[PDB]
Amino acid sequence: SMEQVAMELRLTELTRLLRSVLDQLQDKDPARIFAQPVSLKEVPDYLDHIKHPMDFATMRKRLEAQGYKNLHEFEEDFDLIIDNCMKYNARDTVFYRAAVRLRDQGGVVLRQARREVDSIG
């Protein structure tokens, strides 16, 4: 159908908006602490602590499969990256502090993306 295509054009445009948002959030992690999954070879107990691991490369694979239906699903994944870090790592660590700064700095990008998604539809 002609509708399904119109749907697909918006999903594609959402993917286009979300890609730009992902790049902006990831620029806020210049140390690349959140770029890749936590290694199960290097932290073999990690899944005993964190049940839903997430990282920027994993979010990107989902994004490029147009696996995000709306901004809310995308935000859930971003929030996992932060909250998992803040649980696994103690307060006085470079990792925890990196997550606090990503959360704070990402807030502004996410604020505007929500207006853009409502606005453009």
From Swiss-Prot:
<comment type="function">
    <text>Scaffold subunit of various histone acetyltransferase (HAT) complexes, such as the MOZ/MORF and HBO1 complexes, that acts as a regulator of hematopoiesis. Plays a key role in HBO1 complex by directing KAT7/HBO1 specificity towards histone H3 'Lys-14' acetylation (H3K14ac), thereby promoting erythroid differentiation.</text>
</comment>
<protein>
    <recommendedName>
        <fullName>Bromodomain-containing protein 1</fullName>
    </recommendedName>
</protein>
<feature type="domain" description="Bromo">
    <location>
        <begin position="9"/>
        <end position="113"/>
    </location>
</feature>
<feature type="cross-link" description="Glycyl lysine isopeptide (Lys-Gly) (interchain with G-Cter in SUMO2)">
    <location>
        <position position="41"/>
    </location>
</feature>
<comment type="subunit">
    <text>Component of some HBO1 complex composed of KAT7/HBO1, MEAF6, ING4 and BRD1/BRPF2. Component of the MOZ/MORF complex composed at least of ING5, KAT6A, KAT6B, MEAF6 and one of BRPF1, BRD1/BRPF2 and BRPF3. Interacts (via PHD-type zinc finger domain) with unmodified histone H3. Interacts (via PWWP domain) with dimethylated and trimethylated 'Lys-79' on histone H3.</text>
</comment>
